[PDB]
Amino acid sequence: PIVQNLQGQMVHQCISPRTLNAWVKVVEEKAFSPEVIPMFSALSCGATPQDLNTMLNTVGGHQAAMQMLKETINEEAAEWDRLHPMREPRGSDIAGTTSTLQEQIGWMTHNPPIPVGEIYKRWIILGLNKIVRMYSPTSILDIRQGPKEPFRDYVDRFYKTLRAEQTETLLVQNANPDCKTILKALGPGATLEEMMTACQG
Amino acid sequence: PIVQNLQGQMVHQCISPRTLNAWVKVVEEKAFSPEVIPMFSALSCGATPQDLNTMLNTVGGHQAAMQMLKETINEEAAEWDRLHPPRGSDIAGTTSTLQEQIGWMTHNPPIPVGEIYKRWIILGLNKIVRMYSPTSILDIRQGPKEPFRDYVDRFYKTLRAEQTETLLVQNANPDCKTILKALGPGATLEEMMTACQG
Amino acid sequence: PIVQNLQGQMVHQCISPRTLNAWVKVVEEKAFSPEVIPMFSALSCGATPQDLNTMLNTVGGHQAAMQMLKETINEEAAEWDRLHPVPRGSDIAGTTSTLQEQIGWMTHNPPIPVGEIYKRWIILGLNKIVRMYSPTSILDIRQGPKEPFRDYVDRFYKTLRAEQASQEVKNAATETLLVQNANPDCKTILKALGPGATLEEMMTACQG
Amino acid sequence: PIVQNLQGQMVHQCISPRTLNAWVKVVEEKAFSPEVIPMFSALSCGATPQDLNTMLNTVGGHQAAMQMLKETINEEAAEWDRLHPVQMREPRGSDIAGTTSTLQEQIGWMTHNPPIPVGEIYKRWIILGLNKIVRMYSPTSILDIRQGPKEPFRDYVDRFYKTLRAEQTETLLVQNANPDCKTILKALGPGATLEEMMTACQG
Amino acid sequence: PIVQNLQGQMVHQCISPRTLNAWVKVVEEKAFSPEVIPMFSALSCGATPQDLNTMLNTVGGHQAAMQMLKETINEEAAEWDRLHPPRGSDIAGTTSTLQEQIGWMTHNPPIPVGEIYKRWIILGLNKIVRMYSPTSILDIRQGPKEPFRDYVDRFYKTLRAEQTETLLVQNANPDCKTILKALGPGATLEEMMTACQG
Amino acid sequence: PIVQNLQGQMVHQCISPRTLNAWVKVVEEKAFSPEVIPMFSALSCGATPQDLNTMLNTVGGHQAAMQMLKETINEEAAEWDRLHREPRGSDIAGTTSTLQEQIGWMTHNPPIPVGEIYKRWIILGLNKIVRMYSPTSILDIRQGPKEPFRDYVDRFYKTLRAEQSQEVKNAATETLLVQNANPDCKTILKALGPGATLEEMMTACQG
Amino acid sequence: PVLFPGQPFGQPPL
Amino acid sequence: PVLFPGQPFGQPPL
Amino acid sequence: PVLFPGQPFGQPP
Amino acid sequence: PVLFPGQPFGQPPL
Amino acid sequence: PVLFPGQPFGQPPL
Amino acid sequence: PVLFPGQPFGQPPL
């Protein structure tokens, strides 16, 4: 990535072993849960397009997702080329296929800058959101409270599903008879704290 | 976060893998016990609103808790807009850029939007700790063969999550209660625990 | 490797225990899966020819592969000597050159990045090894009776990556061979969707 | 904590994830054994009062001990206020504890010339409170440590000085040894080193 | 410990978590094998007397050894007091402050109280390794079907803890003993081990 | 070890806990396989004689090997004394020299890199130990009846690596690899001929 | 409000 | 006193 | 397109 | 003596 | 060639 | 010799 130093200047650094390992391990462990995306964005802080490509290429397995991610990058690159017919970067130059590390640093450290790293990261995060959407096992409609399931555990499963898919009516309607009766007896506009406190005992 | 350097200047750093991982693991292990809050505060030292959002977003699961946290942020953000006609959304980091957040924080005088947003988050986390607290202080009573040390640990652990002079001694078992009342009022916890040791 | 410092100058540093271990462990765990190469490239960022040799020499086992890799370096070094009749091919490989000479060439103005040239040869040799060691052919990847489409597609593109044939063959394999080798339930749904559909659309269709 | 840098200046740094986790794990594993205190002191090297509070607050459970710790702090803070009644404002007991002082004032005092090390003063109170807790939580008395029938002397001596460390020698160590070793130790005579005693009761 | 910085000046630094943990874990895993001493010396590189005491006090258990260590420190401290009418107790860190310790260590000419105290500690640890050595060199003899390599490992491992020409060859088994004596005196260990391979 | 800093000056640093542990663990796990040597060399980058002694001394067990290593150091130290403040053989080994003197020689202009010279002796000793501890000779490596060629070649060059002369190893490789293959693959490799690359040979004996 | 359900912390509106 | 029972360490009073 | 099916990230045309 | 049985290392006297 | 079979990577000749 | 059998590495003689 490109970061500051003691002298207060933007300079290129090699990607660290910690960051390389962290990203490989989070994908191995969490696959494509919603929380992988913010972890990717944080681990790719100040990254060049080269660095992003390295991070994506270090992923073994999940090649369905990586292929979906390529198609998203293509769609965003094609849109950039349409809207953008100092030499300004093409879509391929942002994706790091037709641009050198010198050129990428050149754009990112220019005044005014063209942050090709942050633009390419935007396309990648956009593709990762679609993959999380896909890899979401359950639909929001199928999340319903069990016979002896606590309300806390039900709400956890509801919003976890909702996060991956992406509230007022569906949350209360799919609760069990005992809690549903209490939740409708609290009325509309109640906070989630008030609802959970009501269905505790 | 924003931190000092060799030259003695406030500059932006990328949030570290160590910090990211530390927060993910403490949530995975401790869920929302009282001690999770001070650990969050420490791990988010000098954090920007962007950094605070990153830390919250990295939490997998507990989405009931995280939704209650959002609703708290909305309430405090709405309250900020009322008192200040940086907006509430700018402090939360939805409508503001990293450059603006660093701008406010490193300004002279500084507007610490990171610390204000952290205050909202910690306020929201305290509510979640309240909710997720299982036992009431009134239900904590010393067992038959339970050492007094163990009973006191359960008492103040419950008291910490909920939020003494009368309730601690009154709920103790017969043997210890007799000794504690015999010691009299204004006795230190050290003296009380030493008295009910054997 | 050679990296920048506080003053902003290109200076030599020792290869870190973290880097040494990371490379040893990735080879131990992943052998010669396609993803080992970009890890090698990243872990060897700013590396001198000496550092590249260090990393390769730390690999225990896999000596057939390391011998194949040596022969690739020999082929590329001979070509370099052919195209450059006066850094020799042997100087880029770090046999006949010292660390001081390697740092000299790399930090010169204009520079001759012998570390990057040698890495290019090493990566070219590692790719040949990955091809050799690929177990399955793309023609043998076919969706199981009760295998989810996601898992089938994963195996397909994982295999396609390791085979690494020409772009025309990869495009042709993906267009016709992916759908043709899917199971009847999904196959009917994919052909019903029509050609030119994105992978997202295909996988969303065969989810349930 | 407050530490030096490249330029050689005392500056504030955020407490590290390593230091935070190290302190949480040592309490989880060692509870309040004697060796927890020197680990706390080392991990809190150069710490501000804020940092000391952060470390104490990160401890889950052991709230009987933390309450006993809070009471010890109150006694030492009360003693500070007595000895120090009423450039920057002179620190009260509550300022040293980090309840009524800001981080800026804490850094101010610690990096002043001459300095007022509020971090070290507050640590002294905490370590004094932790010693009392180690005293309390010590399971066995020194009088109850006696060598078993087939227990080696080395293992016995370990248990002796382990118990002695938590409670806080010449007569009690030899007298509570088993008959076979006791005869050999008394035969060696007084003023013999522990090395000579342990060598004698090896076989 | 006291180390250099960017400016090139000897300055105090806090002992790190890594170093603290590394010393705790090596004592837990290896107890007092000969190799624990060189690891202590390396982990206490540039250490002040305070740091050395910190490392020793962090050890839980092995209090028999720690007590033996104290008695060694006393003997060496008394000997220093005799030879120097910085006292012995100041080098041990009992009667000296960190500032005074740093003063002596960074003085010109320096008085390395860290190294002097480490020398006493290492001298005490060597005695503890002597004590805790299970086997004598006389008892180490090659088994019936034991390879010569494994025998020589047990020989020199034992020799290291206790602390060669005649004892090594004479305690080998019949088949190897005949070959080693046939090779003659003044032969290298490599030649000896190559001889008793098959 | 001795390393550079921000100011760009060769200064001494304490050996790190990471490096200490890394060396302890590689010897614990890999013992004395060929690949332990380049790891030792890398982990001891810019090391002083004292650091090298620290690393060797931290090794528990393997004392037969460490003794052979001492004997090699003695021979090389004696050789140095014969061929040659001015450093003696014992000064390079770190017995009769202080850290002050070692830093002196290493940061001198012109420098006498006693750390690198002492590493050369240790590596030369470690090579002998790898030779010793090598279980199989290259002559005894022969392709099994149903052993894949890839596995056979792995064993051949693993053994060859531990055996270590360049003129011999080349002659061994050229003739011995093909000659010790099984009948079916051997016919194919000889048909393919001399000067064929290992890639071509392994491809030819795949099926 | 600032944050909506099932969206990330810091999601910009519109 | 400085710290009341139950309140966290470094808790500002009032 | 920038990336054809199955080609590495950053792979030039 | 500098260190007495039972007391920690670097413990001040008296 | 630069590297003969059996020799370590980067090993000098002669 | 420089190193004797038994004594550690970097051990001064006598």
Residue numbers in the entry:
A (entry chain B): 1 to 85, 96 to 176, 186 to 220
B (entry chain C), E (entry chain E): 1 to 85, 99 to 176, 186 to 220
C (entry chain A): 1 to 86, 99 to 220
D (entry chain D): 1 to 86, 95 to 176, 186 to 220
F (entry chain F): 1 to 84, 97 to 176, 178 to 220
G (entry chain O), H (entry chain P), J (entry chain Q), K (entry chain M), L (entry chain R): 313 to 326
I (entry chain N): 313 to 325
What does the paper say about this structure?
Here we report crystal structures of assembled HIV-1 CA hexamers with peptides comprising the linear binding epitopes of NUP153 and CPSF6 and the two antiviral compounds PF74 and BI-2. To attempt to explain how these diverse phenotypes are achieved, we carried out interaction studies using a CA that can be assembled into stable hexamers through the formation of engineered disulfide bonds at the NTD-NTD intrahexameric interface. The complete binding site is formed by NTD helices 3 and 4 of one CA monomer (referred to as the ‘first site’) and NTD helices 2 and 7 and CTD helices 8 and 9 from an adjacent monomer (referred to as the ‘second site’).
To understand how CPSF6 and NUP153 interact with hexameric CA we determined X-ray crystal structures with the same peptide ligands used in the ITC studies. Comparison to CPSF6 and NUP153 complexes solved in the same orthorhombic form reveals that these cofactors selectively bind to one of these conformations, which we have termed ‘open’. In the ‘open’ conformation, helices 8 and 9 are of equal length and separated by a single residue. Binding of CPSF6 and NUP153 to hexamer in the ‘closed’ conformation is prevented by steric clashes with loop. A consequence of cofactor binding may therefore be to alter capsid conformational dynamics and drive equilibrium towards an ‘open’ conformation at the CTD-CTD or hexamer-hexamer interface. Within one monomer, CPSF6 interacts with N53, L56, N57, M66, Q67, L69, K70, I73, N74, A77, S102, A105, G106, T107, T108 and Y130. The ligands diverge after the shared phenylalanine, with CPSF6 residues 315–319 intercalating between helices 4 and 9 in neighbouring monomers and making contacts with residues Y169, L172, R173, Q179, K182, N183 and T186, including hydrogen bonds with Q179 and K182.
